[PDB]
């Protein structure tokens, strides 16, 4: 999902290009080409364009890809929710959404996001040792 300090989202400059901006420390900014909706469903009926994503989680994932040999394909969650177990309004059929919904459906292989480690979500999926403390 779009994390304010960890995942920076930028539209392409002219056509599918990311401006190779640098930091103030001589370190090039490493971005990734990401595909996701432009606005919400009420706002954007259907507007998904390849954009440029970078930040903290992107650096972590790129370090991971550097460590072990495997490619990846980034996309975005259709809405802006982590994921809740909500039963159908009338059918009362429990269901997940957001990142958890897209991961349970099989469309997602690995969620790399500032996830909140908790028992309810650990009951359905697995975790690695925490990288963060806060």
């Amino acid at each position: 999902i779009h994390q304010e300090p960890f995942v920076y989202v930028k539209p392409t400059m002219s056509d599918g290009t990311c401006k190779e901006e640098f930091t103030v420390n001589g370190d090039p900014v490493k971005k990734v080409i990401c595909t996701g909706p432009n606005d919400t469903s009420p706002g954007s009926p259907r507007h998904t364009v390849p954009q440029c994503c970078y930040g903290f989680c992107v650096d972590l994932l790129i370090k991971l890809a550097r460590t072990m040999n495997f490619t990846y394909e980034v996309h975005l969650v259709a809405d802006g929710k982590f994921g809740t177990q909500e039963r159908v309004n009338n059918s009362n059929k429990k269901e997940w959404n957001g990142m958890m919904g897209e991961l349970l459906s099989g469309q997602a292989d690995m969620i790399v996001a500032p996830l909140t480690i908790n028992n309810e979500r650990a009951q359905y999926i697995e975790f690695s040792k925490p990288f963060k403390y806060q």
């Binding site: 908790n118 028992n119 040792k129």
Partner: protein, 244 residues
Amino acid sequence: KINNSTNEGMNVKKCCKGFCIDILKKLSRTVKFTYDLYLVTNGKHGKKVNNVWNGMIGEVVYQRAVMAVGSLTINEERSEVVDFSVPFVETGISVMVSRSNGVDQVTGLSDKKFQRPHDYSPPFRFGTVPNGSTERNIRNNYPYMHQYMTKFNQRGVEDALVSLKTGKLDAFIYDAAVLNYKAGRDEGCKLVTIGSGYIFATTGYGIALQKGSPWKRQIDLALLQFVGDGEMEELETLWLTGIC
């Protein structure tokens, strides 16, 4: 053991308490298992001496025991031999100095003091517990630091604490949670902690299980639930005291 000439010994029965023992009692309340607590006579936590471990690692790898509720450090070589559950307390490593007497001080492991004690006019000294877990971190990250720490070695945890109070030691390196409690009850509060686990490991405390233990799913469910309902918070109040 009775004497040093013979290896015969006696199973003296004592009473145990503390903070981690509170965890073990509450675990049997939910999982409803049984235990036969005892103490390691071999020695410290674990050290692979020519592919031979000792202490708790020697008791779970060799499967003479099952688990170890005692405090243990999470690293690579210990994660190879056994499996850890989820951690519950946020503890790093830190350096203790009597900053309080009668600013920048040690900025951290990157401080210029850890480049050469001769770089500064007063030749300081700082060591750790011999055959300890943190000693491995120094060797893996800075072998030169181990060479400097070779002449700054000490014997006892409180012995170094005495040395810092008396002035026989300048700085000392040990875990955060242990050194935080000793500084929360100390009279005078001459010794001062450095940072908040900022330039340090920022790891956790875990329970060593035999590899592939079926208890692993049940144990982790309770531990996350234990921190998920505020019960873990009260135990910190009971066994931790932060003044000022």
